[PDB]
């Protein structure tokens, strides 16, 4: 492909996650209930790394990814996931090109700077080879426009037990250089029945550079308490281990706590290291004398 | 395929008929864990996995939950909570050659026991000691893969055996692998015995336009009792209310 070196080197920034990153954990319908669940969630008020100019380096994939972007001309197209991405390990590719949404699992031959060039979209220099293809999926064709910000796109990617689950949400926004404070639920989009081993990924960007900046967060196993409204839409949630007040809310299974004293949990010191103490005897007893005997 | 490279197939969107498998006498071993074989027709399964390989006759017993051995620990491991069926039959008619069929391999040495339901394909030279192999076979450099010497003259225990294992998983997803059951038209406002994708029970069906369920298949209550379902044939939301009862 083509190597781009006109990129200023800057340390990654950070942003407050606030109350972003809550999805529907199952396919059952509940309403007017407070349900306690244990699932991989983005912690509230967490530390979210922020990138930018063209910037798309290799990013780790520990247990899940919260990918959030805000643009006005649909500059971002797709993503690449994998472990080595050099025809040695199984890799994934999602591209929402000008034609439709295409997903491939074939083992490609990736260069070090995959990107698309364009207003008409002409350059296609992401990969060179493709062999041992296993899965392929194409969505219905559609025309996608190439030209503060206006909308937010939030995506959640998790890979559990051979299933690749994707969640998404598009919402209007009046902010320019900040992550909004508020709550919004994320409906599930696609469940891919493909068992890839993912530890690394990289995003696509699209010679003139446009205004594009995205945030990345990470999900970890946390217990949450979720409030369903009359219509079954999640409108509020509580991180069960954020602070003692949230722990009290979990214990009472309610979002309102009255004045008083409550018991929440227990305190226990954890061990540091293991200790083994055995006698100093060293002589192998003869199991062979009783096992390798000619006559019983 | 070989043991270390056992093949796996996805099974979904099925009018699945298990009667032909059970009634056939061609299978020497047919053991199901967690499900009675005779009831397989009625159940509906979310997704079906099929794993196929060929092994030695002595090692068919090792394909079972909570079993230890060379092939269970190093080639194919079954979880202790496995649910599904295991099928095995003799294959001397096809996998035996007088000069020796060496197309089948199995793993001998690995660093540690593998987790259940995972595949290892690497052919790196095993390091049994301290001297690095550096990619060259020799002393302290044993190839982990060994070939079965299948011949028509082998003993009954050394005969090749073809093993196909089917695993069923059930969870909060719309079932897509069902059996051969004819669907009947539904009746509303009457205490009936419904059966929606194997979710049997009883109650009074009622048109519930109040619920929405944009993408949810089923609804439920405080206890493990369903409160609303969607008709698989035509997609609308139906409420379930139990029949009246009381003391006398």
């Amino acid at each position, epitope marked *: 492909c083509v190597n781009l070196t006109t990129r200023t080197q800057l340390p990654p920034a950070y942003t407050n996650s606030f109350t972003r990153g809550v999805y529907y954990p199952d396919k059952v319908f509940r309403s007017s209930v407070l349900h306690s669940t244990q699932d991989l969630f983005l912690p509230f008020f967490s530390n979210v790394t922020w990138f930018h100019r063209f910037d798309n380096p290799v990013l780790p994939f520990n247990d899940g990814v919260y990918f959030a972007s805000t643009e006005k001309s649909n500059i971002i197209r797709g993503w690449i996931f994998g472990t080595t991405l050099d025809s040695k390990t199984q890799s994934l590719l999602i591209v929402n090109n000008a034609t439709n949404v295409v997903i491939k699992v074939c083992e490609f031959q990736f260069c070090n700077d995959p990107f698309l060039g364009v207003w008409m979209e002409s350059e296609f220099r992401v990969y060179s080879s493709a062999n041992n293809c296993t899965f392929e999926y194409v969505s219905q064709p559609f025309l996608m426009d190439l030209e503060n910000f206006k909308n937010l796109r939030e995506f959640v990617f998790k890979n559990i037990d051979g299933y690749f689950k994707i969640y998404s949400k598009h919402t209007p926004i009046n902010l320019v250089r900040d992550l909004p404070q508020g709550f919004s639920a994320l409906e599930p989009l696609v469940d891919l029945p493909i068992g890839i081993n993912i530890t690394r990924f990289q995003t696509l960007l699209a010679w003139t550079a446009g205004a594009a900046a995205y945030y990345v967060g990470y999900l970890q196993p946390r217990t949450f308490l979720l409030k369903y409204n009359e219509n079954g839409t999640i409108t509020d949630a509580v991180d069960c281990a954020l602070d003692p007040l949230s722990e009290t809310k979990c214990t009472l299974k309610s979002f309102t706590v009255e004045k008083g004293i409550y018991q929440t949990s227990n305190f226990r010191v954890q061990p540091t290291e293991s200790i083994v103490r055995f006698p100093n005897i060293t002589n192998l007893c003869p199991f062979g004398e009783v096992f390798n005997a000619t006559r019983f | 395929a070989s043991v270390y490279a056992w093949n796996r197939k996805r099974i979904s969107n099925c009018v699945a008929d298990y009667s032909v498998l059970y009634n056939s006498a061609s299978f020497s071993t047919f053991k199901c864990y967690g499900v009675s074989p005779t009831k397989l027709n009625d159940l509906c399964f979310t997704n079906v996995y099929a794993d196929s390989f060929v092994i030695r006759g002595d090692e068919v017993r090792q394909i079972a939950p909570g079993q230890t051995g060379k092939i269970a620990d190093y080639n194919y491991k079954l979880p202790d909570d496995f649910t599904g069926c295991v099928i095995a039959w003799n294959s001397n008619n096809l996998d035996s050659k007088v000069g020796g069929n060496y197309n089948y391999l199995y793993r001998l040495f690995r660093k540690s026991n593998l987790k259940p339901f995972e595949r290892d394909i690497s052919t790196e030279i095993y390091q049994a000691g301290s001297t690095p192999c550096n990619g060259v076979e020799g002393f302290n450099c044993y190839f982990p893969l060994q070939s079965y010497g299948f011949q028509p*003259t082998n003993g009954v225990g*050394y005969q090749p055996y073809r093993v196909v294992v089917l695993s069923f998983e059930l969870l909060h997803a719309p079932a897509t692998v069902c059996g051969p059951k004819k669907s009947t038209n539904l009746v509303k406002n009457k205490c009936v015995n419904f059966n929606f994708n194997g979710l049997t029970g009883t109650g009074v069906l009622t048109e519930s336009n109040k619920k929405f369920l944009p993408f949810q298949q089923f609804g439920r209550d405080i206890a493990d009792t369903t409160d609303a379902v969607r008709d698989p044939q035509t997609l609308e939301i139906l409420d379930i209310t139990p029949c009246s009862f009381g003391g006398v």
Partner: antibody, heavy 123, light 108 residues
Framework: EVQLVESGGGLVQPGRSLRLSCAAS????????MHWVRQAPGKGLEWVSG????????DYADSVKGRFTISRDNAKNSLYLQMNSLRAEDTALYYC????????????????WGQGTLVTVSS | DIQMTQSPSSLSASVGDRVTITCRAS??????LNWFQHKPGKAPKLLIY???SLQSGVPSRFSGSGSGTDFTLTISSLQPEDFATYYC??????????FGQGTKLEIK
């Protein structure tokens, strides 16, 4: 690593007698069985005789019954084979094999052997 | 009675070939066969006891198989020190320790 050395071979006239010995030192001799194996000059191996760990059960080959008498001495770790009434068809090579078990007629085979001693019956 | 036969008599191969030798019995012996490697210059040595059990201390190149009435010995690598005569012996019937005829193996 066990040693089995034989002696007593040579040339005798037909109808004369000769004795053989085979000394074992590399293993425990008091609880294993031993045999004698004959190899013709231009044929395959052939079993001749065998004795148990203790001299209770003794068997002989069909062609040598009534002529050969095998013995055993557990004290000096050696066995003997007295060959009597030799004919012209016993000019073969004799080995001193060791049985894997303790009996004479068992599925167990001959585990350790020794270099043969050459005998000849001619004038 | 029982009869023991050897299908092959003289074989030719190279340093990097594979050789199989078969031994056939007149009656069933139930996996009770033994294979011996007889070097022409020294004392013969046992390789395989039982149908397919390999004796300790010998290379794993030799591999035996078979049960019932027919048996077969297989060698995988043919190292150049593997020239000898091989015999198969039964230890199951009334005629004690019957030896089959020789099977000369030369490499060329």
């Amino acid at each position: 690593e066990v040693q089995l050395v034989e002696s007593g071979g040579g040339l005798v006239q037909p109808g004369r007698s000769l004795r053989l010995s085979c000394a074992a030192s590399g293993f425990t001799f008091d609880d294993y069985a031993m045999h004698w194996v004959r190899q013709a000059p231009g044929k395959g191996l052939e079993w001749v005789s065998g004795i148990s760990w203790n001299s209770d059960s003794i068997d002989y080959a069909d062609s040598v019954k009534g002529r050969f008498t095998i013995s055993r001495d557990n004290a000096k770790n050696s066995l003997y084979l007295q060959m009597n009434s030799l004919r012209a068809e016993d000019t073969a090579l004799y080995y001193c094999a060791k049985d894997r078990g303790y009996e004479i007629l068992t599925p167990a085979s001959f585990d350790y052997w020794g270099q043969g001693t050459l005998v000849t019956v001619s004038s | 009675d029982i009869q023991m036969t050897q299908s092959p008599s003289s074989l030719s191969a190279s340093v990097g070939d594979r050789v199989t030798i078969t031994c056939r019995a007149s009656q069933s012996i139930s996996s009770y066969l033994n294979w011996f490697q007889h070097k022409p210059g020294k004392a013969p040595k046992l390789l395989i006891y039982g149908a397919s059990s390999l004796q300790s201390g010998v290379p794993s190149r030799f591999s035996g198989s078979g049960s019932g009435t027919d048996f077969t010995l297989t060698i995988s690598s043919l190292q150049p020190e593997d020239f000898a005569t091989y015999y198969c012996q039964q230890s199951y019937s009334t005629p004690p320790y019957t030896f089959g005829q020789g099977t000369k193996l030369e490499i060329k």
